[PDB]
Amino acid sequence: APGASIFRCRQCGQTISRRDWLLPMGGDHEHVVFNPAGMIFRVWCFSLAQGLRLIGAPSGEFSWFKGYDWTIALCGQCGSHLGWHYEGGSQPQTFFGLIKDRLAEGPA
Ligand SMILES: O=C1CC[C@H](N2C(=O)c3ccccc3C2=O)C(=O)N1
Ligand SMILES: [Zn+2]
């Protein structure tokens, strides 16, 4: 009966990802980053996620991960901004960077 199994949207409980799907980009699944608006994010990288809605066309502008373009990822249920989907790169071609404090971790 594991308690650190899956990640849900902290605002509504939508299933989003799984601890098994953590991805160590540049040798670490956690990346502490800032956007141009000065906001700091503790981003956890996942190979896969579900229950999101990706908004707009990809952009390479200010990407925290070299070679990847990003799209905003909202919770598909409640609209909470949960992170970004990254695409266009290599090994892997795509992944998700999700904001740790916007997810709730718990049992499957
Ligand atoms: O990899 C990324 C993801 C998107 C991101 N980002 C933001 O969080 C943001 C907020 C306001 C205006 C523009 C940005 C954008 O480049 C960011 O800075 N880098
Ligand atoms: Zn939600």
Angle, alpha carbons 24-22-20 (nearest 5°): 135
Shortest-distance ligand to the CA of residue 86: 1
Query: Exposed/middle/buried for 9, CB within 10 Å: 0-12, 13-18, 19+?
Result: buried
CA torsion sign, 83 to 85 to 90 to 91? Answer: positive
Whose C-alpha lies nearest to ligand 1, atom 8? 35
Within 10 angstroms of residue 41's Cβ, the number of other Cβ atoms is: 19
Resolution of the experimental structure, in angstroms = 1.6
What are the tokens at 98?
A: 């999700």
Q: How many residues in the chain? A: 108
Residue type, 78: C
Distance CA 26, CA 56 (A): 26
Whose C-alpha lies nearest to ligand 1, atom 7? 35
Q: Which residues line ligand 1 (CB under 6 A)?
A: 35-37, 61-64, 70, 84
Q: Closest Cα to residue 65, out of 103, 101, 96, 37? A: 96
Cα torsion 30, 80, 10, 17 to 10°: value is: -50
In 3-state terms the chain splits into helix, strand, coil percentages (rounded to 5) of 10, 50, 45
What are the tokens at 8?
A: 């849900």
